């Protein structure tokens, strides 16, 4: 293979150890080229972590280490901290392509973060948006862990079958997940029903919030 292969992800508890393998082929590792490793924390540029199979640039702690045999290379991380979460790429050179190649990257997850139920707030359309002949219901879902959530909408007590757009959940700066669901209605549809409900399911619990055109009057 003229490409490097890394596992898509590894996980480990705080203070424990993980190992990230990287395998290549005859035209890179088999040609005698060293392997380098790079760390990419969220919203940051790649940083050189290991060069020349097992050397650390100045400043890189001893708990990040590398090794390489003829076929495989590995990055080891001991004493895992939450700040280690991110993507880790191996790198080498390939003679058949005559260029630099990178591994697919391994996303490191540091376990131990406790379960957290979502905080859910449901917003009705603003008067300004209604004045512009648009009605959007906004279901904001914050501070939950782990990432999976399911959203269902109800017009009165009937399931809404159109107009729903929900975000893939993603971690925010607080290391917790957030998500949003938007129900697009016409002003007429909004005023036609008695209420609307956003329903959020997360780790054996469901929380539902309701808004009505009549309230606040």
């Amino acid at each position: 293979q003229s490409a490097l292969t890394q596992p898509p992800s590894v996980s480990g508890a705080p203070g424990q150890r993980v190992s990230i393998s990287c395998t290549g082929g005859s035209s890179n590792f088999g040609a005698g080229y060293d392997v380098h490793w790079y760390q990419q924390l969220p919203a940051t540029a790649p940083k050189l972590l290991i060069y020349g199979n097992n050397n650390r640039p100045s400043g890189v702690p001893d708990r990040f280490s590398g090794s390489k045999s003829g076929t495989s290379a590995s990055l080891a991380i001991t004493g895992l901290q939450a700040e280690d979460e991110g993507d880790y790429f191996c790198q080498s050179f390939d003679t058949s392509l005559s260029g630099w190649i990178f591994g697919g990257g391994t996303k490191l997850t540091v376990l131990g973060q406790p379960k957290a139920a979502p905080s859910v707030t449901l917003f009705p359309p603003s008067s300004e948006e209604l004045q512009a002949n648009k009605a959007t219901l906004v279901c904001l879902i914050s501070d939950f862990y782990p990432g999976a959530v399911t959203v269902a909408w109800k017009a009165d007590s009937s399931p809404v079958k159109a107009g729903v757009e929900t975000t893939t959940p993603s971690k925010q700066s607080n290391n917790k997940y957030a998500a949003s669901s938007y129900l697009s209605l016409t002003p007429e549809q909004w005023k036609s029903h008695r209420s609307y409900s956003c329903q959020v399911t997360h780790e054996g619990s469901t929380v539902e919030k309701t808004v009505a055109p009549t309230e606040c009057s």
């Binding site: 380098h36 790649p46 050189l48 060069y51 990178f102």
Partner: protein
């Protein structure tokens, strides 16, 4: 210290071209070669090419079919990447990196911050921002009041939001951006702490969209 600083984000139509720059400092510019590496969404890092900062010799990846050109201005300590005939697969963050030769190889010991190039046919557009509220603005019923701003109809990503009570920055809750069918984006930002009562104009959300050179503040939640 050694550092590479790149130019800002760019938007281009398909078939156009883009030039990104990489200004070097903290070391002898012509003594180290510079590489360019890109990272497209949902893809791994991909080597673009190399340029010798002394004589200007270049070596490009064959994946680009001559669509890329690298240059350097020794007087300016800057290298440049030109990528022509842009397509949607070129939407990516483009990094520059310094090549370091050790005893038995070369690695990329220092990286620029990255420049996001977005290739799209949708025109750049500032966001509309609506004040949204849970709790009726003037609640009689002792329910907490949550303030948020609904941010829609902008392109490209992203927007930056900050909240203020008077002059002090306030804690906020951020959310993903989502792309609509029309290719324009939509997002929200929520004031973290619930309120009870406040003077009109006390709180505000500030939505910055650098691509459209615009900034929009909402400081009034009216009666509904």
């Amino acid at each position: 210290q050694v550092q590479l600083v790149q130019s800002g984000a760019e938007v281009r139509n398909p078939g156009a071209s883009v030039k990104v720059s990489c200004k070097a400092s903290g070391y002898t510019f012509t003594s180290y070669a510079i590489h360019w590496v890109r990272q497209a969404p949902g893809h791994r890092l991909e080597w673009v090419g190399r340029i010798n900062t002394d004589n200007g010799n270049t070596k490009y990846s064959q994946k680009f079919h001559g669509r890329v050109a690298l240059s350097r201005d020794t007087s300016a300590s800057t290298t440049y990447m030109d990528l022509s005939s842009l397509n949607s697969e070129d939407t990516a963050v483009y990094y520059c990196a310094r090549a370091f030769y050790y005893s038995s190889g070369v690695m990329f010991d220092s990286w620029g911050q990255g420049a996001l190039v977005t290739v799209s046919s949708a025109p750049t557009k500032a966001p509309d921002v609506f004040p949204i509220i849970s709790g009726c603005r003037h609640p009689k019923d002792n329910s907490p009041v949550v303030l948020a701003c609904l941010i829609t109809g902008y392109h490209p990503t992203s927007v930056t939001v900050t909240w203020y009570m008077g002059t002090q920055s306030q804690p906020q809750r951020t959310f993903p951006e989502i792309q609509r069918r029309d290719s324009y984006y939509m997002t929200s930002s929520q004031l973290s702490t619930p309120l009870q009562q406040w003077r009109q104009g006390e709180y505000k959300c500030v939505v910055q969209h650098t691509a459209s050179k615009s900034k929009k503040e909402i400081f009034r939640w009216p009666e509904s």
